[PDB]
Amino acid sequence: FLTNTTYDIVNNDTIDVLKMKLRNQGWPFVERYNAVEIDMSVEPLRSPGQ
Amino acid sequence: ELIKVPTIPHNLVLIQSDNGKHALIKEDLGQWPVETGISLVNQAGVFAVQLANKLGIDKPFVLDAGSNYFTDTSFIDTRKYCTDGLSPREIQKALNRQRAYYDRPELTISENKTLLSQSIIYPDADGNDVSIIFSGAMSHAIFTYAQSQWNKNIIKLDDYIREITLTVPKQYRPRRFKEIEHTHGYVYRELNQGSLLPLVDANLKESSSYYFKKLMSSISNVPVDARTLQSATAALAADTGQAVNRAQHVSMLTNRLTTANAPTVRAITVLTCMFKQFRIGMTYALDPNIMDVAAATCMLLFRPAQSISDEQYRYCLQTMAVFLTNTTYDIVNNDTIDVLKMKLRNQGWPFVERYNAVEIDMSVEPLRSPGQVGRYYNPFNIDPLTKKHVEDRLEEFINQVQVGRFRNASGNAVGTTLAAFLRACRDKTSANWRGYSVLVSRYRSLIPNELFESLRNISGEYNINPQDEHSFFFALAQINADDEFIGAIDKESAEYLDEYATLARDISNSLTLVKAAFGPLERTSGSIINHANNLNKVINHVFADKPLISETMLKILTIDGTTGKDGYRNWLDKLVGHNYPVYVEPVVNIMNFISARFVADSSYFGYTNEIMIMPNHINVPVDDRFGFRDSPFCTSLPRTIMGNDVRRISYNVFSMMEDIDDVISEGFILYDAYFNFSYDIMTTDGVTRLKEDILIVTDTGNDIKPIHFYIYFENRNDKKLRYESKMNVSYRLYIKTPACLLPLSDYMRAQHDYVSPSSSRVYIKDPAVVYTRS
Amino acid sequence: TSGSIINHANNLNKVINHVFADKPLISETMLKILTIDGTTGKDGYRNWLD
Amino acid sequence: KLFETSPFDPLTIKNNQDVVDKLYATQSSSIQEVVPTKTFATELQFGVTS
């Protein structure tokens, strides 16, 4: 959409090559962000807790 | 859709006398009239089709006879007694009657248990169910062979998905399968791909016209977003010097810009960039003008080099040289490419070169092209990597045209006008190449590789007018892909898949017919007459009732203008003596097996190949196993009788004879013909005689009348019947013993096994592995 | 001694309902386990019997 | 209750085809990984007939 290409042309491009192409144009969203884990415990009530 | 056969098709019939002394088992496959003087294999196949229809074998099927069982009352017996085939109760009753004749005691309890448990269903190692039942030999063999042949095409779902995994496009949504369909899924699909190249090669222009017409009817309706023609004309007029008071060349360029035929030129561009070799040409005016130069430059610059032929290239260069180089058509008629290029370059014109388009490989495999990679040309000669024209000096060339002097020593009117026009066209192409590339890719995904490499435009129906070309490049529209267009394209993809499969099947059938029917041709007359008559007979027979050939094939053959019968006749004639490989389908193997068994075991179908006729006063060894009185059956025809060889006569020589009395006074073996016969085994005792006379004598010739035996059982102590047989009948006809006849005593040979696949298998009707996007 | 695995398990539930008709809990609970197991198919029915 | 609508009634089915069909009928009442739509074919061949 942004670099004026087609799916066939960039079909064989690896992930790093695509990231360079997007960043050169000026597109910074090329990264996946890990989700922080939240601790949680159900309170024991007439049954063993988890 | 597989058909689950619930019952085994046995054909055993138990025939027992009223006394009960004799009993026998017979296989009923019917009597089929077989002719002489014609080939036997053809009649065998004609009868084999009907035999397969009779047994429920012709259509694809699987066996589902596992559940036809019961269990005994006794608690030890856990065995599953099958209910199919000749029930053991019938054989028990017949044996009990036979022992009742001989004053023997009836079958004991232990013997009854032994007999009634013969037919049984037991599991097999892999889960199949084996049913052992009383059945005939021919039915058993044919059913088992057909089961194997049809089982050759049933494959697990995972294997099929693996086979078709290369051709699934990226954009479509994967289809979830139930876990049962993964663990126990089975699909019946033929996986051999029939080549469409015979039809394409034989009649190239019909197929090319059909496919091109369908593709362009599809492409013409693509939505586009286009800049206003008046706005572009205003921009160009401002770029140059355009005034309404004074005539100018820019006015000539901008006076005939028509967008009316834009969709047709768009479709032509897609077709050029889609196929491997698709030629297009333009016919310029007799007196060339600036429009012709603009259109020729546009063709040379932005149309692919493969699309332009050498003659078209020479014609374009000639027109350009006529306009820009102070010359006439007659001057450059003998001029070659190099001279034209040098002449145009000397005056300063650099646009004298063709430019090769750059191929792009498809992400997924082309349809119907196993183990192959497909490719298509990028539109407008733009390199996908560099995102610009293949010619890297295009701006310099435009500046050269701008500063050059054409048609006038002083003044840059023509150069400026052409430079402005070319710059506008270049900007439009550079902006809009992407959508055309996408459309070309998608529409290329619809045609296989054989059509990609074979189809050519030879009728010249799809040409582009110079005005249309220059207008199309000046006011290029932006191709817009809407959801409705994609849905329509998916529907057409399904239609093309179905039509390709039907064409392949029709081609295979036609190849089989032309191999089986027509032989080689010769330079001699009479051979031509025979070929013409056979061709007419074949055409008339195949077109009667339900036509053998599909409607789409008739359409593509007719598109030339023929009646439909004429086109098919011409194609069939063109296919005589081919070398194209063909695939032996399971049905062909089944028919061949049944025909071979029909030819070999003749007794099962009511016809023999030799018979014997001898007087009643000559004793004859006979098959006395059954107990028939004066049995007309012999185990084998006597080679020698009474110490002398039995005379053998062909049917033709016997018919030609005129002294039949002398040769019949001794008796003889007729052969060299197929003798059809029938018999009616009657339960009672009586004289065994034919319905009609053995022989008929005419002044033209001698014939043997139809044979219908009236077989009766035998009581030894009957003076009336013995005297009637000895004295009333004077001549007897003997044939070899039918193989369908079988005594009750050796019933264990009728035991036969049938295997049915596991009931846990689930069958997928639609093995598609992907869903449409919307 | 006869019949498919699905038929054998299905008819056993009907007899369980008939014999234990006084307390409908047993029939309700068994069908609950069979519902989760029956999705797998004939293999799931076998797992239920074990 | 484990299920809003039961995937199938265990007593109605008699073979694996029946449970597959019942799942295909009841799948609309469950959260689906891929919502069904028209199926798209990519390979299809017709064999010769009798």
Short mmCIF file of N, CA and C in Angstrom, two decimals, chain B residues 611 613 648-660 663-664 668-671 675 694-697 701-705:
data_model
loop_
_atom_site.label_atom_id
_atom_site.label_comp_id
_atom_site.label_asym_id
_atom_site.label_seq_id
_atom_site.Cartn_x
_atom_site.Cartn_y
_atom_site.Cartn_z
N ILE B 611 -20.29 -76.95 -32.01
CA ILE B 611 -21.35 -77.87 -31.64
C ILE B 611 -21.16 -79.16 -32.43
N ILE B 613 -23.39 -82.68 -34.14
CA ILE B 613 -24.67 -83.27 -34.53
C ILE B 613 -24.42 -84.71 -34.93
N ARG B 648 -14.76 -82.25 -38.75
CA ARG B 648 -15.01 -80.85 -38.42
C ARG B 648 -15.30 -80.07 -39.69
N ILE B 649 -16.38 -79.29 -39.66
CA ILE B 649 -16.80 -78.49 -40.80
C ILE B 649 -17.01 -77.05 -40.33
N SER B 650 -16.53 -76.10 -41.12
CA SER B 650 -16.82 -74.70 -40.87
C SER B 650 -18.27 -74.41 -41.24
N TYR B 651 -18.82 -73.37 -40.62
CA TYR B 651 -20.21 -73.01 -40.90
C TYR B 651 -20.39 -72.59 -42.36
N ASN B 652 -19.43 -71.86 -42.91
CA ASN B 652 -19.54 -71.41 -44.29
C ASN B 652 -19.56 -72.59 -45.25
N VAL B 653 -18.62 -73.52 -45.09
CA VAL B 653 -18.57 -74.69 -45.96
C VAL B 653 -19.82 -75.53 -45.79
N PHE B 654 -20.31 -75.66 -44.56
CA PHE B 654 -21.52 -76.43 -44.31
C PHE B 654 -22.72 -75.81 -45.00
N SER B 655 -22.83 -74.48 -44.96
CA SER B 655 -23.92 -73.80 -45.64
C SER B 655 -23.82 -73.95 -47.15
N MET B 656 -22.60 -73.88 -47.69
CA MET B 656 -22.39 -73.99 -49.13
C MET B 656 -22.67 -75.39 -49.66
N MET B 657 -22.83 -76.38 -48.78
CA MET B 657 -22.91 -77.77 -49.19
C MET B 657 -24.20 -78.06 -49.95
N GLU B 658 -24.18 -79.18 -50.69
CA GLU B 658 -25.35 -79.66 -51.40
C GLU B 658 -25.59 -81.15 -51.22
N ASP B 659 -24.69 -81.87 -50.55
CA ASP B 659 -24.84 -83.29 -50.27
C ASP B 659 -24.92 -83.53 -48.77
N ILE B 660 -25.72 -82.71 -48.08
CA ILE B 660 -25.77 -82.72 -46.63
C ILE B 660 -26.25 -84.05 -46.07
N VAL B 663 -23.18 -86.49 -45.43
CA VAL B 663 -22.34 -86.09 -44.31
C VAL B 663 -23.11 -86.13 -43.00
N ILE B 664 -24.43 -85.98 -43.04
CA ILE B 664 -25.22 -86.09 -41.82
C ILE B 664 -25.49 -87.54 -41.45
N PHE B 668 -21.19 -84.71 -37.43
CA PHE B 668 -20.02 -83.86 -37.59
C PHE B 668 -20.05 -82.73 -36.57
N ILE B 669 -18.90 -82.08 -36.43
CA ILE B 669 -18.71 -80.96 -35.51
C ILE B 669 -18.68 -79.68 -36.32
N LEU B 670 -19.67 -78.82 -36.10
CA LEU B 670 -19.70 -77.50 -36.72
C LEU B 670 -18.90 -76.51 -35.89
N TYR B 671 -18.05 -75.73 -36.55
CA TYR B 671 -17.26 -74.71 -35.87
C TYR B 671 -17.15 -73.49 -36.77
N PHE B 675 -22.43 -70.02 -31.84
CA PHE B 675 -23.76 -70.63 -31.77
C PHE B 675 -24.45 -70.19 -30.49
N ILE B 694 -33.18 -79.22 -36.06
CA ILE B 694 -31.76 -78.91 -36.04
C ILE B 694 -31.35 -78.13 -37.28
N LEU B 695 -31.89 -78.50 -38.44
CA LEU B 695 -31.36 -78.06 -39.72
C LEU B 695 -32.49 -77.63 -40.65
N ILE B 696 -32.20 -76.65 -41.51
CA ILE B 696 -33.13 -76.20 -42.53
C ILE B 696 -32.38 -76.12 -43.86
N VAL B 697 -32.93 -76.76 -44.89
CA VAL B 697 -32.31 -76.84 -46.21
C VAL B 697 -33.11 -75.97 -47.17
N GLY B 701 -29.20 -72.16 -49.47
CA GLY B 701 -28.20 -72.69 -48.56
C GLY B 701 -28.84 -73.40 -47.40
N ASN B 702 -27.99 -73.89 -46.50
CA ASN B 702 -28.40 -74.64 -45.33
C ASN B 702 -28.11 -73.84 -44.07
N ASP B 703 -29.05 -73.84 -43.14
CA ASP B 703 -28.92 -73.09 -41.89
C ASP B 703 -29.23 -73.99 -40.70
N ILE B 704 -28.77 -73.56 -39.54
CA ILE B 704 -29.07 -74.22 -38.27
C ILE B 704 -30.06 -73.35 -37.52
N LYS B 705 -31.21 -73.93 -37.16
CA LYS B 705 -32.27 -73.19 -36.51
C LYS B 705 -31.89 -72.88 -35.06
#
